[PDB]
Write a protein that binds this ligand. Structure first.
Ligand SMILES: O=C(O)C1=C(C(=O)Nc2sc3c(c2-c2nc(C4CC4)no2)CCC(F)(F)C3)CCOC1
Ligand SMILES: [Cl-]
Length: 134
């Protein structure tokens, strides 16, 4: 067992706040924002040895990353940015930093009660997306 075990499973989106504005800050175009904002993804998190896999599954699009904590990887985001990403565990929080074109955004995942809370931040704009077990 590992601390990361509290994340593993299949999670469904139950609430979203400020996501359109977060996407605007990131640079997502209008049509993608509208379709993304309508999505109700499932988030599937699994671990095999040192490799963590996170899959986001929705209508329109499925995206999946696999990574080792602390080890940078190149990532194509759901909005088609090519970014360089690093994910670490900081005091029980999974912290995902994405860098591209001199910009940065951070996505944090935290277990709070029976929820998986996702906080997305770009400059001063935060979006909070709450998932529950499917
Ligand atoms: O997993 C999340 O809740 C999180 C995110 C999420 O779900 N984004 C989703 S789902 C989803 C899409 C996007 C999306 N994002 C973005 C920019 C903001 C990054 N452009 O498109 C597009 C296609 C889809 F078919 F509609 C399905 C993004 C932020 O980090 C947590
Ligand atoms: Cl780490």
């Amino acid at each position: 067992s590992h601390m990361c075990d509290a994340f593993v499973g299949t999670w469904k989106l139950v609430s979203s706040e400020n996501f359109d504005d977060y996407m605007k800050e990131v640079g997502v175009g209008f049509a993608t924002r509208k379709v993304a904002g309508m999505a109700k993804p499932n988030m599937i998190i699994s671990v095999n040895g040192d490799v963590i896999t996170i899959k986001s599954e929705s209508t329109f699009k499925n995206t999946e990353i696999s990574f080792i904590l602390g080890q940078e990887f190149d990532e194509v985001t759901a909005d088609d940015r090519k970014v360089k990403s690093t994910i670490t565990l900081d005091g029980g929080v999974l912290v995902h930093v994405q860098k591209w074109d001199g910009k940065s955004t951070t996505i944090k995942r935290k277990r709070e009660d029976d929820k998986l809370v996702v906080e997305c931040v770009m400059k001063g704009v935060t979006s909070t997306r709450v998932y529950e077990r499917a």
